[PDB]
RNA sequence: CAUUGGUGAGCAGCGAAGGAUUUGGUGGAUUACUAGCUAAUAGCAAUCUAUUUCAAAGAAUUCAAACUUGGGGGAAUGCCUUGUUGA
RNA sequence: AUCUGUUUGGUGGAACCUGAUUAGAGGAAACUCAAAGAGUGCUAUGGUAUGGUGACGGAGUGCGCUGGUCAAGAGUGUAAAAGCUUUUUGAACAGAGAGCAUUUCCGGCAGCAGAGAUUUCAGCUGUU
RNA sequence: GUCGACGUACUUCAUAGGAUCAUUUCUAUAGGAAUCGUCACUCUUUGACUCUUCAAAAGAGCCACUGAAUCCAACUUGGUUGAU
């Protein structure tokens, strides 16, 4: 039977261990009794994934004991024999059998992947790719596995082509998940930032382009808005107008969180990216006017633009002319908006300018801070 | 189970009653009678060839795999 | 043994743990169940006696038919077996081979006689009544169930006196006389 | 009227800090009393086995050996017997 | 009604006959013991078991393999063509992990430095 | 006249075609259908046990000690402001 075959496959390792001074024959017999129990539990009916986990833990501690015994007796870090890789091969085989039998246990899949990544020198990139291929075919609608695949390929191999292909296939399978779009934008921004800093490194060693601009991330942004809106409508499909307004509000939050990612990206042209996203939101969506449909969100976007005109610049090195231009834009927006909207926008702008400059610098310390306090009192 | 049975049959095919059971087939009566007629005729040819080999001091022994061939165009 | 599958039965046609050819159909067990025979060897002792009868009958048959010796001995055997009660009739010579059975002898045992005499409802009841000391054949109490009753001896197979069975039947008919001890 | 029918309710009488049925277990007896163990003229009983082995004695059917079978007919092949063939 | 006696339903069940059965026929109790039958449920999965006995693995390279495109050749057709076929070759490109080879390097040590979760990890500089 | 011959009347004797089973594989036919080391559940049949009815009958017997059950008596508690 299968248990007998697997035990007879375990035999040559114990031949090697007895041949070296590492283990006594009785100790080998006790180890094989435990392995007999575990192999019977795996190959019988009524098994669980916990039996696989316990067997892997047992083999791991056997390997640790073997390492200590090889350090102590022979005074060598490792022998050149079968026994130093055979337990590792067995643990990989137990993981493979467990994933084949219960493919739905994502924790066991993660344990398999972590183990195969951890034994880096002995494993193969081909093996990690095969485990990813099996797992991605079995669970194509799990976004985290696609993200982990792309992350492994980006940090370990720095394979930007494979990372792009992984993200594109994953978004083909999961077009409704905002998280995968976000990670794709983050990867592309990381790639172009690394290209920019690599060009800068070259320019300092020795002696434009839409790729360096960020138009790839902008196109991913636009396709994200269309696809996420369409799939959100398909999931939740006068009342249609209310649903469209709710969809626009839902997309607005993801857009603002993309804005926060752009603000996190300091090296990139934040002003360019914010200009593009506010251009998109200035363009009408869902057959309704944005400002008329969501005046609170329109006022929020106007205040966001007015603040981010100078928010990229530090408060210590703030430009009085830029602050005056922002205040003039705020006054124009207040004139355009309703009186309650103008009052709310003025209060928000005053609070933002206060938290920017008034807490940072004193009116006695800076002569321009007195003018800022006067402008805040006027607002 | 089937592979083990085949290997065991191959191992012990040489035994008397295993051979007896294994070679048994039901054969039509015409084919069986013609087989025994051909057996008798072959035995008669064998005794005639034995008499010829007794008469002739040196007769060539021709192979069963040679008997059917009258000739070849290109000689070897 | 579980039920054999089709391919197993072909290779195991002769296999049987419960019926063997030497058992002869469990004829002995059948006869002991019919007549409540307790001893195991009673059928085979009876069968040996039947075999002696049949061997003697075969030899008398191989004698010539118009032989005074043959005719006298066949009539002697027929009369003796009829007097014992093994043979119901004396008409035919061929009954000395056809109608001599173990069951014919077992029908002359005391419980079968009592059950035919309506003394007991079953042969097993008759067996128990014999072992419990209720039955006498003449003045003599018989507690052996294997005791064989002759045609003449049938007329004295009776309940013992002072028997609770005898008192019960007399009390049922309202004819119990306590001076007679019942 | 009878009830040698059932189920009950009550007297006389009997009558000592109760009475009446039923049932499990254990002990003694059920033949007529001379003690336990063993390798037994003795030793042991807390065993010994660190003397427990040597020597002596000891081999007929010249393997005789189913007194052991239900009855009637048989016996391909077994088995038994006898004869024969070749070693 | 010291009227009448048919019906319907209970109770009872002799004689004859008929059928079946026979250590007489049952009944009750169970997380009891035993012999079998039938039907279900359950990844129930080696068509030749795993990535490895330093007889090895990892990295790299060479060869091979795959796909479409382009060019050339050949066949067919034509008044020239176009078109079509190709078990013909070349080049560039995109690959797969899926074969083969290695007389390249790494699975010793010392030191530096970084990162990860005090240890670990690969890497660098030397040496063997 | 349990006699013959003849006449008459009566009684009884057919047979086939096909399939299956029977050889510890094969009943003679390729026109057919069966080769796997058990895990569990459900249902069903049967037999043991223990008790018992029809429904009895017989007690390996006697003493002693030691438990248990049941029915009365007595005592206790509840009960006509309601036991059964």
> What is the rounded distance in angstroms from the CA atom of residue C79 to the CA atom of residue C91?
10
Q: What are C109's strand-pairing partners?
A: C148
Given a contact cutoff of 8 angstroms between Cβ atoms, the answer to whether A253 and A239 are in contact is no
C3 C-beta less than 7 Å away from strand F:
no
Select from A165, A175, A110, A188 the least CA-distant residue to A143: A175
Answer positive or negative: Cα dihedral of C77, C78, C81, C87.
positive
Give the nucleotide nearest to A90 (CA→C1'): E50
Chain F: nucleotides under 7 Å from a protein CB? 22-26, 28-30, 34-37, 39, 55-59
Chain centroid, CA A20 distance in Å: 48
- DSSP code of A368? H
Chains that touch B (3 or more CB pairs under 8 A): none
Answer positive or negative: Cα dihedral of C32, C33, C37, C41.
positive
> What is the rounded distance in angstroms from the CA atom of residue A132 to the CA atom of residue A138?
10
Q: Stated in angstroms, how far is A76 CA from E119 C1'?
A: 21
- DSSP code of A20? S
Q: Which residues are CB-neighbours of B61 under 8 A, at least 6 positions away? A: none
> What is the rounded distance in angstroms from the CA atom of residue A95 to the CA atom of residue C98?
83
Q: Furthest-apart CA pair in chain C: how many Å? A: 79
Given a contact cutoff of 8 angstroms between Cβ atoms, the answer to whether C86 and C152 are in contact is no
> What is the rounded distance in angstroms from the CA atom of residue A192 to the CA atom of residue C40?
106
> What is the rounded distance in angstroms from the CA atom of residue A231 to the CA atom of residue A237?
10
Q: Stated in angstroms, how far is A161 CA from E84 C1'?
A: 40
Q: What are C159's strand-pairing partners?
A: C135
Q: What is the DSSP string of A153-218?
A: IIIII--HHHHHHHHHHHHHH-TT-HHHHHHHHHHHHHHHHHHHHHHHHHHHH----HHHHTHHHH
Q: Write down the number of H helices and E strands in chain A.
A: 18, 0
Q: Stated in angstroms, how far is A161 CA from E90 C1'?
A: 29
A120 C-beta less than 7 Å away from strand E:
yes
- DSSP code of C179? G
Given a contact cutoff of 8 angstroms between Cβ atoms, the answer to whether A188 and A261 are in contact is no
Select from C85, C59, C52 the least CA-distant residue to C74: C59
Select from A268, A228, A272, A222 the least CA-distant residue to A247: A228
> What is the rounded distance in angstroms from the CA atom of residue C102 to the CA atom of residue C109?
11
Q: Stated in angstroms, how far is A344 CA from E73 C1'?
A: 81
Dihedral pair phi/psi, residue A3, rounded to 5°: -60, -45
Helix, strand or coil, per DSSP, at residue C137: strand
Specify which residue's alpha carbon is closest to the C1' of nucleotide E106.
Answer: A121
**Backbone angle region of A75, left / alpha / beta, with phi > 0 → left and psi within -120 to 50 → alpha:** left
Match 């940072």 to its residue by tokens. Answer: A360
Q: Stated in angstroms, how far is A8 CA from E17 C1'?
A: 82
Chain centroid, CA A128 distance in Å: 19
- DSSP code of A356? I
Q: Which residues are CB-neighbours of A41 under 8 A, at least 6 positions away? A: A47, A51, A55
Given a contact cutoff of 8 angstroms between Cβ atoms, the answer to whether C134 and C160 are in contact is yes
Give the tokens for residue A135: 């797992």
> What is the rounded distance in angstroms from the CA atom of residue C96 to the CA atom of residue C53?
7
Q: Stated in angstroms, how far is B21 CA from D17 C1'?
A: 102
Strands C157-159, C140-141: pairing is unpaired
> C-alpha distances in angstroms, C13 versus A50, C8, C142?
50, 8, 50
Helix, strand or coil, per DSSP, at residue A285: strand
C16 C-beta less than 7 Å away from strand F:
no
Q: Stated in angstroms, how far is C179 CA from F61 C1'?
A: 29
A3 C-beta less than 7 Å away from strand E:
no
Select from C31, C25, C86 the least CA-distant residue to C57: C86
B5 C-beta less than 7 Å away from strand F:
yes
- DSSP code of C150? P
Q: Write down the number of H helices and E strands in chain C.
A: 9, 3
Give the nucleotide nearest to B24 (CA→C1'): F26
- DSSP code of C156? G
Burial class of residue A253 (count of CB atoms within 10 Å of its CB; 0-12, 13-18, 19+): exposed
Give the tokens for residue A145: 């596995």
C39 C-beta less than 7 Å away from strand E:
no
Q: Residue-wise over A217-241: b if at least 16 C-beta within 10 A, else e?
A: bbebbeebbeebbeebbeeeeeeee
Chains that touch A (3 or more CB pairs under 8 A): none
Q: Nearest 5°: CA angle at A171, between A132 and A218? A: 130
Given a contact cutoff of 8 angstroms between Cβ atoms, the answer to whether C95 and C80 are in contact is no
Other CB atoms closer than 10 Å to residue A85's CB: what's the count?
A: 14
> What is the rounded distance in angstroms from the CA atom of residue A44 to the CA atom of residue A262?
55
Other CB atoms closer than 10 Å to residue A120's CB: what's the count?
A: 11
Q: What is the DSSP string of C4-19?
A: PPHHHHHHTTT--SS-
Give the tokens for residue A181: 């779009």
Give the tokens for residue A42: 């795996």
> C-alpha distances in angstroms, A309 versus A217, A329, C60?
21, 10, 143
| CB < 7 A to strand E: residues 12-71, chain A | 12, 15-16, 45, 47
Chain D: nucleotides under 7 Å from a protein CB? 70-73
Q: What are C136's strand-pairing partners?
A: C141, C158
Q: Stated in angstroms, how far is A40 CA from E120 C1'?
A: 35
Q: Which residues are CB-neighbours of A123 under 8 A, at least 6 positions away? A: A116, A117
Q: What is the DSSP string of A318-348?
A: --HHHHHHHHHHHHHHHHHS-HHHHHHHHHH
End-to-end CA distance of chain B: 51
Burial class of residue C126 (count of CB atoms within 10 Å of its CB; 0-12, 13-18, 19+): buried
Select from C145, C131, C118, C153 the least CA-distant residue to C36: C145
Q: Nearest 5°: CA angle at A219, between A214 and A223? A: 150
A312 C-beta less than 7 Å away from strand E:
no
Q: Stated in angstroms, how far is C140 CA from D31 C1'?
A: 30
Select from A36, A1, A15 the least CA-distant residue to A86: A15
Q: Which residues are CB-neighbours of A235 under 8 A, at least 6 positions away? A: A176
Report helix, strand and coil shares of chain B as percent, to nearest 5.
60, 0, 40
Given a contact cutoff of 8 angstroms between Cβ atoms, the answer to whether C92 and C78 are in contact is no
Given a contact cutoff of 8 angstroms between Cβ atoms, the answer to whether A265 and A311 are in contact is no
Q: Which residues are CB-neighbours of B9 under 8 A, at least 6 positions away? A: B18, B22
Element spanning C141, H or E: strand C140-141
> What is the rounded distance in angstroms from the CA atom of residue A276 to the CA atom of residue A220?
12
> C-alpha distances in angstroms, C97 versus C25, C58, C76, C77?
20, 8, 15, 12
In angstroms and rounded to an integer, the radius of gyration of the C-alpha atoms of chain C is: 23
> What is the rounded distance in angstroms from the CA atom of residue A131 to the CA atom of residue A117?
11
Walk across the sheet containing C140-141 and list its strands.
Answer: C140-141, C135-137, C157-159
Give the tokens for residue A22: 């590492």
Give the tokens for residue A284: 């009408």
Give the tokens for residue A318: 């703030």
Q: Which residues are CB-neighbours of C162 under 8 A, at least 6 positions away? A: C181, C182
Q: Stated in angstroms, how far is A178 CA from E95 C1'?
A: 31
Q: Nearest 5°: CA angle at A52, between A50 and A53? A: 60
> What is the rounded distance in angstroms from the CA atom of residue A25 to the CA atom of residue A17?
9
Q: Stated in angstroms, how far is C145 CA from D32 C1'?
A: 38
Give the tokens for residue A364: 């006695």
- DSSP code of C109? B
Q: What are A285's strand-pairing partners?
A: A288
Resolution reached, in Å?
3.0
Q: Which residues are CB-neighbours of A113 under 8 A, at least 6 positions away? A: A128, A131, A132, A135, A148
Q: Which residues are CB-neighbours of C23 under 8 A, at least 6 positions away? A: none
B24 C-beta less than 7 Å away from strand F:
yes
Given a contact cutoff of 8 angstroms between Cβ atoms, the answer to whether A146 and A136 are in contact is yes
Q: Which residues are CB-neighbours of A244 under 8 A, at least 6 positions away? A: A233, A286, A287, A288
Q: What is the DSSP string of A100-162?
A: HH-TT-HHHHHHHHHHHHHSTTTS-HHHHHHHHHHHHHH-TT-HHHHHHHHHHIIIII--HHH
């Amino acid at each position: 039977s299968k248990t007998r075959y697997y035990l007879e496959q375990c035999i040559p390792e114990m031949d090697d261990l007895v041949e070296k001074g590492l283990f006594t024959k009785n100790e080998v017999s006790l180890i094989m009794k435990k392995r007999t129990d575990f192999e019977h539990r795996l190959n019988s009916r009524g098994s669980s994934i916990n039996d696989y986990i316990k067997y892997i833990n047992y083999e791991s501690n056997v390997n640790k004991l073997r390492a200590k015994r090889c350090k102590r007796i022979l005074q060598v870090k490792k022998t050149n024999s079968l026994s130093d890789w055979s337990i590792q091969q067995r643990i990989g085989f137990i993981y493979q059998r467990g994933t084949n039998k219960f493919p739905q246990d994502l924790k066991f899949w993660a344990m398999y992947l972590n183990y195969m990544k951890a034994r880096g020198n002995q494993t193969s990139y081909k093996k990690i790719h095969n485990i990813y291929n099996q797992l991605l075919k079995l669970h194509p609608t799990n976004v985290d596995i696609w993200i982990s695949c792309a992350k492994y390929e980006y940090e370990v191999h720095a394979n930007f082509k494979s990372c792009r292909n992984i993200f594109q296939n994953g978004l083909r399978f999961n077009p409704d998940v905002p998280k995968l779009w976000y990670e794709y934008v983050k990867f592309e921004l990381n790639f172009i930032t690394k290209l920019i800093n690599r060009r800068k490194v070259m320019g300092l060693i020795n002696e434009t382009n839409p790729a360096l601009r960020g138009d790839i991330a902008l196109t991913i942004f636009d396709v994200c808005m269309k696809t996420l809106g369409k799939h959100y409508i398909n999931k939740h499909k006068k009342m249609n107008i209310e649903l469209n307004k709710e969809t626009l509000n839902y997309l607005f939050s993801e857009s603002l969180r993309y804005i926060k990612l752009f603000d996190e990206f300091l090296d990139l042209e934040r002003d360019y990216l914010i200009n593009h996203v506010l251009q998109f939101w200035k363009n009408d969506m869902y057959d309704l006017s944005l400002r008329k449909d969501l005046p609170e969100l329109y006022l929020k976007t106007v205040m966001i633009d007015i603040t981010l005109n100078i928010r990229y610049m530090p408060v210590e090195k703030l430009d009085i002319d830029q602050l005056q231009l922002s205040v003039k834009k705020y006054f124009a927006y207040i004139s355009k908006l309703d009186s309650a909207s103008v009052k709310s926008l003025k209060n928000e702008y005053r609070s933002y300018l206060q938290d920017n400059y008034l807490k940072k610098m004193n009116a006695e310390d800076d002569p321009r801070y007195k003018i800022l306090d006067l402008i805040i009192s006027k607002l | 189970k089937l592979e083990y049975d085949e290997k065991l049959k191959e191992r012990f095919r040489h035994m008397p009653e295993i051979k007896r059971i294994s070679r048994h087939r039901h054969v039509p009566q015409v084919i069986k009678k013609a087989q025994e007629i051909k057996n008798i005729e072959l035995s008669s040819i064998k005794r005639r060839e034995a008499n010829e080999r007794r008469t002739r001091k040196d007769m060539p022994y021709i192979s069963e795999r040679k008997k059917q061939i009258v000739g070849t165009v290109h000689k070897y | 043994v579980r039920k054999l599958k089709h391919h197993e039965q072909k290779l195991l046609k002769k296999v049987d743990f419960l019926e063997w050819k030497q058992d002869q159909g469990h004829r002995d067990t059948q006869v002991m169940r019919t007549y409540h025979i307790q001893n195991r060897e009673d059928y085979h002792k009876y069968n040996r006696i039947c075999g002696d009868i049949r061997r003697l009958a075969n030899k008398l048959s191989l004698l010539p038919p118009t032989d005074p010796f043959r005719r006298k001995h066949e009539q002697l055997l027929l009369d003796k077996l009829y007097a014992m009660g093994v043979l119901t009739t004396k008409s035919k010579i061929s009954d000395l081979e056809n109608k001599v059975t173990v069951s014919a002898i077992c029908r002359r045992r005391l419980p079968v006689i009592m059950h035919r005499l309506k003394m007991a409802e079953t042969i097993q009841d008759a067996v128990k009544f014999i072992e419990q000391g209720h039955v006498r054949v003449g003045p003599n109490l018989i507690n052996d169930p294997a005791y064989l009753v002759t045609r003449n001896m049938e007329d004295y197979v009776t309940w013992v006196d002072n028997s609770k069975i005898k008192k019960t039947l007399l009390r049922y008919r309202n004819q119990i006389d306590d001076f007679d001890f019942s």
